[model samples]
Target: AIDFNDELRNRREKLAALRQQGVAFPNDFRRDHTSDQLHEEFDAKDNQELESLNIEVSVAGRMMTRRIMGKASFVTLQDVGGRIQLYVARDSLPEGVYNDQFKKWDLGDIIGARGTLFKTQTGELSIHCTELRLLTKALRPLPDQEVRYRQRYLDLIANDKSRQTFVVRSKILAAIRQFMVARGFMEVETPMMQVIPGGASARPFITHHNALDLDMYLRIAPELYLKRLVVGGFERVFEINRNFRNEGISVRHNPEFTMMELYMAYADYHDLIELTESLFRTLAQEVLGTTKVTYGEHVFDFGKPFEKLTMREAIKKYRPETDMADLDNFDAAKALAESIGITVEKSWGLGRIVTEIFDEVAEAHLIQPTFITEYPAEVSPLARRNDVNPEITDRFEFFIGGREIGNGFSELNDAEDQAERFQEQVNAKAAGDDEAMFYDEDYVTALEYGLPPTAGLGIGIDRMIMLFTNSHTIRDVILFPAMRP
Candidate 1:
């Protein structure tokens, strides 16, 4: 990455020139009002009293726009809350202040103005400036004002709606925290760097620890660790943290992401599904003021009962043309997948083929909130098997706006069954399924000590924010999203 500090160095030299002339930037300056409060409260009043009294209010902000009318000028200043226009008159300013300093200020400069409020002839509320000081000189021009995505900071300044989306994002996170706390879920922290990345099947970024002289991996999921807390007898526990995964980036995927994972002892997948629906509905009403929200071209009603179906039934309904016999037999599933133009790399078995078919064919068309439940045992080794059909696990994933936002499963607490599943995963890994999960003997040992039949759920925080904010890209909701240098 290139350092663009040379421009700042030049600006510093200009400031030094001012100090040599006995004029210095103020050491003490305070704002009585934010840009928003000033616009809303004073815009309606005539400011006749202010003009007569010559009220001097000090305000500081980044210089966003500038127009030179030779002797006088007008510039827009953007503060923390919002932007306000400042009218500068050369005649009223100190002699050298206007001629030597003000003229040298750049568009990106930080400036302070002592001025009186007045409405322009065109009816725009503005500050008429008497004195101005350069708080910090800017060396580089900001991105073009017309294009917001080009300069996110400038976009935030120029557009109030963009700023409001961020405010809503904060509110959503706080609301989620409140919801969890009210339900007796204690928030906990876990290690970001792990020795063996367990839980979800994703490749991890590897790094070397200089002090310990060992190889460590960034965690792909906090699932295994949170379950350890459950083993320690914390009946309800949750974590809101960053999970790093070495994966492809999409509008829905990031290299690093936020997830809210919760584990509750004595609960099953059925209870989790109900709890998930209630939480979403409450969020929609509290944050958005209605259970029905308009996202993009469609309106989604979160108030309605969420549709639930087993994975097989969902695939059959959405892709009924496929032969039913192929869904159960591994070779038949492989042949069918290959015939439909899906590349069969290895004999990935029935469950992998089903997951691939769903991703390829039906995932995007699921526009509303739906629970696709009962995943095949091969793909859900960590989940408890459905009592009626041992071939499938009692797991469900919550989907909204064509995206998988949450996943939950009735945990496999039987020590013997868990051991067998771990062996199966090991076998799958040996057969070239690179994403197959690792065998954690300790987790099994904890289960032997009798982990109450618990249900665990993991929610993708970024995706939830995107749905509520009508954000088209995950990058829009996440501040400082990954960018190539």
Candidate 2:
């Protein structure tokens, strides 16, 4: 249903005429150099040196621009690495080919040029063409941002910045993998579909299997299955994969996103915090060649030690208006939350109310790398209760640029305690909390066989890439990000 205008129609007409010629889209041309290779090899050479070098090269790329003249022309060609100029002359090419076929080729058409590398008078590295041939025609024009995102192939072809974002994203993934492997973590894959979605606190995307005559849910996290692996004696394991959640889309939240979930046996939240700091610093230095990065107006230095604050201390520091006594008392916390425009249900407990208050008042102020520790036991279903203080769990969520980037904790391995937590979650689900987790008896059975004391961490991969690339939106870092039909 394209609304083809005169330009598109003319391009189609040219394509139709091209069909009469032999092999309009031929793959016979073998490229001797990429645009980057040409630039790297001949960028320093002057006109006389380039001529003396006699470098004959074949390059293929999209025709980005052309300045046609009576007997000679200059065109810009863009390949995956970068762009290079082409110097085309009438006498150098086969007779009638320049005026007949080459001139008719559109700007977005893919073409091959066999030429000698030389520098232009303006000092730009260029290809002096001996021959040229069309590879393919782009009949339609590439539009602006909306169309570019919708048609990502055109975006990759048209926008250098878009291309670089994805390139960096790939590098970031590789760097994470390398970091994990070097640290003796075995990479693992877990199920994407689960019978009981019991990893993180999020709503599930449900679907049916006709063969089994049963309903299944897309996994909100790999935490449960990964823990099962720990029970089966994989001491250290990690997975970099997708997790699906039936959640609202925003600059931060995507319906389906990537996560790097890792578990280490006989460790606590403390060990993972140190690991996270090292990994962040390493990724920054390895991928970008710097420990400092800037996103919008905020500058982050990953090389420096990240700040640490207990949940109660963070609340007290960020929301000094509220007394610490108010947070300890459920009734007073409810009143405080209500005063700050945060809604609290009559059924909500002290932990939920305090969490809501902190999220609203303190989270945005944590612009630098920080670890907010000592989560309330009621809210941390999978985390172990502190021995000294049973009311809070040994958990921490790491944040950078005022956004939660990672969560880790000492895992709750006590089968009896875990069952009680599951029952509580089930009760919450029955009491109108749709995002409450479902009970997984099998996971409890794995715990009964004895899972060792362990620590687990889940890092938001997409958001990490966004920070690394200085991308303002999650969609910009993701190639072909989910869009409304």
Candidate 3:
């Protein structure tokens, strides 16, 4: 790290000097063209052609670099579009303005220049300044040190890939919304704060309202709320919003993250799988402009149909040494789990142990686009049970780059079964499973009104962006990631 003592004094001195002449920050300067706009318009023309046309324009940006060669200087300015160079000659501006104002301006200062567009001797498209003014004095020099989350502006300024990644993320969201709407899905909003946080099995952040004098939990998932909308006859509803979880932080886990949840009435898990596959293909084609997405060490083809496997099939595919019979029986699965070094909870049944084994031995090996279906009913409380097998649900979780990106299922619309599952979850919570769910009375009541056959899917948007952007960590993709102080 550079010495803050001297640099702080230098920047502070400039502030004091500016205020001595009245207001240092002026707002009158307006830009007619952005950095990229100038390049796009004039990059094809030669310097001789530009002199004939004489394109006069105004531009403003943060001073990114400075090359002072006596009376004539070249400074690079960066705005939202990109970077552009500004050529300042002593003769071009009014006398003494260069020494008093332009030369005194620091690198991080916001500057506006009224100039004519031209090509230099080196043939770089640049602005030849007729007038220049310092718009804002940056009190602190932009540091080379890393504390990115604390001030994301520095990261955006310093990292080109970071800026591009965020831009692509925005495009990805827009493309997804377009796809959802085209497929007849109605975008909707659900409450962030809930009386009962009954969704995915996770702990929720709690806050109290002063007037109501009651504590409410931040939604862990919008699944329950969105499904209630389905019962209300909004058969095709979706929400893309924040979900708060009082959980541990890791590369894949953030306390609060964005989720895109959609429910379609009269559709089964099979239909949702098709929609998920199609959505990825469409996003890849629209956002990244290709079906092939490259991550750390794998290339996934979203254009092709994703591989499908049952939970046991996937487990057997990756962990071939395990006996299939061992995963089917409760006692055998527990024994198998303990042998593989998974500390099985006392309250866990066969289904939970099987899933634990899958996570332990199979999840990371799924490097391409793959779907694992027939999830254990115990872990999928809101999903419908398979008619042939009551213990397993018609649910599927899709994986990419060895990570679970989405979960979808034929929703359990039967009020009795939902209530029973909620009771089961409540019992698990009582037995000290902190991540177990709550018995949501309101949600169960909604089901009693007779919901149509529906299927829902939830995508971890951060992880999806990571896959598309080739971002290594979740922190890199998120603009202001949560960090420990």
Candidate 4:
């Protein structure tokens, strides 16, 4: 990176010169219309129509581009709505105001102008300024990827798509809230710091409280707490909030990320699967204005029914060399996993071995919207066990564009069963499995009080935005991604 001291010194000198004349910064200027509003209402009018109407608009924004000549100048002013052209003729503005201030104004200056609407020879709508003033002066020039990411303000200013990505993010979340509410789901909040993190099988970020003299864990997911709400008679509940994981950072992973967790009583995984499909399909139609969306090279057709497959079925479909019945046997499953590139871990049972093989062979090719169900009971501690298969749980993981988007399941509501699962997880943790759940007696107590048949789903909000916006990395969707010094 090049030094900015020269530009810094030059801008400071300019500011000092302004102080000699008048106020260096002023905030009295008021705006009557935003750039987009004006364009929307008046852009359709011809020059003759605009001349007859004589519409005056007071607008304010950052001075993005400038074209200066002897007695006239043109600038592109960018505001929250968008950019609008400004035509500044030396004779139009108050006498020497143009020569002294407007002409010397820098590109990044925040300025306000009152002007009459007109059409240029190039058929572009423009504002012919009768008054103009600089409102704020930025000393530093605009700066690229790392700098832009760290300093998101500059990235937002320089890139139009970057700005729209966040705009669409806002719209997507708003739509989700509305959709959930309309479906009789109530939004709720839970404690971000917990005494024991019991939601998902992931290592949690730990922090200490000075007054209490006890350490607490950041939320891995809101699953357990939201289910507790269901037991409290809040039958349908959802939470959209932050969760932290003490994990590696990659294009797909963020230590701190956002998720939407919803729990509905009297429902099962099958019902939740329908909800998932409808949410994505409707969100695509509402946000992108179509069910079919282009993400990089593939066109994801959300209008169609999402493809469904059991874990065993997917393995059979993609890795046809394996027999389905072998997964039920520990020795055969271990042999099959070894035959593929999957290394069978000493701690893994047949269930875990089958899951590892599924991960290695099937996930990447699930480029379209697909649901893989019947996860191993060993891997799904919080999901209900399947009635037909005691070794497998009634769970599903949703995938799109070869990446897992969410995890959902028919929640395990049996207190005795949940206690056993938590103990198994505790044993695994003791055996050096850091990514294992801790025993949560309080949550088990809640289940003992009689939670109804419930289904819960959690979607990674960050990754969902990434897919919708076609962002290549998680950092692109996040405003300030964590950085290493």
Candidate 5:
């Protein structure tokens, strides 16, 4: 499904001709400076100052642009940090080298150059090349947007903004690690191939191990294992890793995504709300140098404390026509949900119906940072039930830019209560709810060892990055997002 045009044929012919010279893809060249290093060392120097210093440096990068005249040429070289101009003169190079190599080099070719630092007449910093060597040749030209996602390397090479998004992703991760470590949380790894995917309510991608001849599921979350560690006395623990879910992909949903999950001992959901607020504010300030961020027509100011709303309050505030008394009545709630174009099953309880109504009516209206608390117990199987009302859990989902960015709760530590909840999920799974969680008896056994009344949190790292970078889609922040074959 590819066109083999004359340009392709010519590049292939050039490659074949180069191979006849003994080594086509040689790797002996080494450079002493990067484009960033050169700028950092001599950015302030004037042409006269650079000439007097006579500082010679070697740099290597992909050729981004080239302009050749009668006997002189200028090319732009780009490294990871940024781009710098290269000045090449035929009179200064070995005879025929310019005509033989430099003139024929393509725009995307990787090249090495040794040059002296100087400023051009227009006051742009440049490298005056003494020697140049073709390192690697890019056969195909970089294509437009559609192909860019498929061939991300070409995109990274051709697009500086794409490269910067990944750079920001790296920095955000580093800041998270530093923040967690500074707070005395030990980083740990958990199983990716899980025997029972019990942490979250999502369909799992199943795989079989030939050696063990056993079925396994890629983990949907690290929640259960991290809680097991909490029982084992690793009180403050965190994991920043990948989670896979068999689900539909969209602008916000990816099959595989990065998540940061952590557990703090002796803390409840209330404590977690404060912690989550502080973490976001600090992350914004550290990564972006401001507590205010703009993402797709919405600006969020993390400088102030986030607003908190009970689930019932949010529903009432966003959907004023709904009666509070109707929320507790399954039939009334289901009728209300159906009237509003939300799909619900007849067997769904009041909690499930009300939760669905909230999702449809209230979630998107929360444009600023807000914590929607008191999730239904039927929907939050792993969270601790509220003391006053057993129907609701002491859980909260933090939202920003009109999307759920994080979830936290007072973890259910009572083994008996957790077992009952697992049984309910098993029943739901049997009733054709593919997104229902599997029962993990091992986790219950760990709970029997008495996990403290812990507070745990999971932040969608990709979504957080998208918010910080003002990216509209999840794909913009992820370097190589999932794509159809």
Candidate 6:
């Protein structure tokens, strides 16, 4: 006996009819009214109250939901902004239009509807279809709404939280641009693909340039170049752009992400911390309408004055049980870290050990806006050492909602010190530190020309978006976060 599955496949006889009837996907359709505009303009209590206006509009989107009663049909169409209902009546359209075209379309088909605006008997503001066109056809059905995010297109249609997060993400970005522009900062773009990538401690994502026959590393941070602009006579410069790092992903990090790095001549890390707090407060009010937003289970208050503590003090405050007063003893702190589950691979110093312990043991307790300042000189190669004490540098990392949002420092302008720092980094790399900073001779040459006393800061734009939008995962704020797909 012939297989029954092959018998069902023989129904290609009917499928071939669809392909032969000019009923496959076509692309000549265009739409004018988005769901957001229709809802904003036509959602009224009394339908007759606005009947005299007679608003005609056209909308197109995937048909999200549909209902058919013998001669009339209704469907919910979703656009980027929102969704609206489309109503089609056989009497209103030409005789063959509904029977031949509308009946052939299915859910998940991209369609366009031209109609007059009206409220349904049940009081939903809807489109009364005068014309309908199928823009594209989907051969497969969409997944159900419960976890449609696994497929982004349907999640965008059904998930209110996803849509809101994206909207807030855009506003947060806009507000940052506006804040920088209003403060007289010039926005500039730098090379994403670079040779001898420097400025941060991270592994690079390297790729080859076929035409140039050279290998290039995607930038880990744009700090060194923006400071070059300062050397080139731009007093204030900033870049809001992407950085790629070949690192493991987590709730706080992505392989490819956005960052805003700004440099100003004649400022210190202290000044930058003040600027950081003000900019974050302004962004919070602009994007979320309040300085306090709920993130996961915590209430982060950004309106109040942010706390400022030196790195040693922050560690001491969090680990009162331990005496961190003598971290200068490398062997002691290294043993302490080993005792507390933080393993150092023999290349790290006392400061690196203490910072690792802080991240593992103390970082999550920092739930408010605070500046952890004055880091040890060994870990802060780019920063100018404190004047009175050579043991520490003028650096600060601003943490908010238990995450590091920004890092800044009074940049080291002495070419000799910078060269020594780069040599130390090279030694670290030789000793198998995969994330050590590389020597950039050109940056040192710029310093040789005497760059003014400058302070630079890099803010993680995705993390800032998370703070304002009250999102927990970095993936939630980014529209197309890097995934295995």
TM-score of each predicted structure versus truth: 0.86, 0.95, 0.96, 0.96, 0.96, 0.92
What tens-digit string does per-residue lDDT give for candidate 3 at 382-412?
9999999999999999998888999999999
The regions of model 6 sitting more than 4 angstroms off are 1-18, 144-150, 210-213
**Candidate 3 worst ten-residue window by lDDT:** 142-151
By lDDT, is 3 or 5 better?
3
User: What is the per-residue lDDT of model 2 for residues 1-485, given as tens digits with 9 covering 90 to 100?
Assistant: 45558778988888888788776567787897899888887888789998898999999998989999988999999988889999999888999879887888888888999988888889999888999999888887644455766888878887788899999999999999999999889999999988888789898999998999999999999999999999999979999999998988888888999999999999999999999999999999999999999888988999999999988888888988778899889989999999999878655789988888889888988989999998998789999999999989999998888888999999999999999999998998888778887888999999999999999999999988988999877889888777867
Q: What ranges in model 1 sit over 4 Å off?
A: 1-28, 40-57, 67-73, 90-96, 121-123, 128-131, 144-165, 345-347
What RMSD does model 6 have?
3.3
lDDT of 2 at 447: 99
Q: Give the 10-residue window scoring lowest on summed lDDT in candidate 2.
A: 140-149
For residue 381, give model 1's deviation from the true position in Å.
2.0
Clashing residue pairs in candidate 5 (N, C-alpha, C atoms within 3 angstroms): none
lDDT of 4: 0.91
lDDT of candidate 2? 0.89
Candidate 5 local distance difference test against the native = 0.88
Off by over 4 Å in 5: 1-4
Name the better of 3 and 6 by TM-score.
Answer: 3
lDDT of 4 by residue, 137-188 (tens): 8787754477867889989999999999999999999999999999999999
lDDT for each candidate structure = 0.83, 0.89, 0.90, 0.91, 0.88, 0.83
Q: Tens digit of lDDT per residue, candidate 1, span 377-480?
A: 87887898989999889998988888999999998888899889888888888888777788988888888887888999999999999889998888777766
Clashing pairs in 2: none
Tell me the spans in candidate 2 whose CA falls farther than 4 Å from its real position: 1-4, 142-145
Off by over 4 Å in 3: 1-4, 144-146
**How do these models rank on lDDT, best leading?**
4, 3, 2, 5, 1, 6
